[PDB]
Amino acid sequence: LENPPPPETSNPNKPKRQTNQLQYLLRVVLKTLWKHQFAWPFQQPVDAVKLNLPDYYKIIKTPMDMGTIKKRLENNYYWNAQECIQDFNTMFTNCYIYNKPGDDIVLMAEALEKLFLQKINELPTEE
């Protein structure tokens, strides 16, 4: 069994800018989730070889994880907040689609998502 390559995190030719909303997403949002005791399964791509999940990367179209989101924010991959918020939502929804309600990994995702929703409720207005 193989894992696919991770999501793209570096592209020197991409359109890029640095903005207050993206700074908040790294310094407040990602930082808050990252230090949480339930973060660790989300801090790197799902390793389907390690977990013996030969279907994961046949049924999940757009894998995402916080290690990738952290690198994307660090490399100014995201033009705007909506793109980064979408990556966090993809990460959560992948987890909820692949797993069953009340599974440990789902409880962990739900705790992280509650903190996420609270922090992006106060996403600053774009300057």
Ligand X SMILES: CCS(=O)(=O)Nc1cc(-c2cc(NC)c(=O)n(C)c2)cc2c1ccn2C(C)(c1ccccn1)c1ccccn1
4 Cβ partners below 8 Å, 6+ apart?
Answer: 57, 63
- Scanning residues 46 to 85, which ones bind ligand X (CB under 6 A)? 46-47, 50-51, 53
Smallest gap from Cβ 37 to ligand X, in A, equals 11
Q: Which of 3, 43, 75, 93 binds ligand X (CB under 6 A)?
A: 43
Q: With CA atoms as reference, report the closest residue to 64 among 37, 38, 36, 83.
A: 83
Distance CA 78, CA 90 (A): 15
**Binding status of residue 98 toward ligand X by CB under 6 A:** yes
Q: What is the 3-state secondary structure (H, E, C) of 15-76?
A: CCCCCHHHHHHHHHHHHHHHCCCCCHHHCCCCCHHHHCCCCHHHHCCCCCCHHHHHHHHHCC
Q: Where does this chain touch ligand X (CB under 6 A) — which range of 8-16, 78-86, 98-106, 112-120?
A: 98-106
Smallest gap from Cβ 97 to ligand X, in A, equals 9
Distance CA 42, CA 95 (A): 10
Q: Which is nearer to ligand X, 17 or 114 (CB)?
A: 114
Smallest gap from Cβ 94 to ligand X, in A, equals 6
Q: Where does this chain touch ligand X (CB under 6 A) — which range of 12-20, 24-32, 44-52, 79-87?
A: 44-52
Q: What residue ranges bind ligand X (CB under 6 A)? A: 41-44, 46-47, 50-51, 53, 94-95, 98-99, 104-105
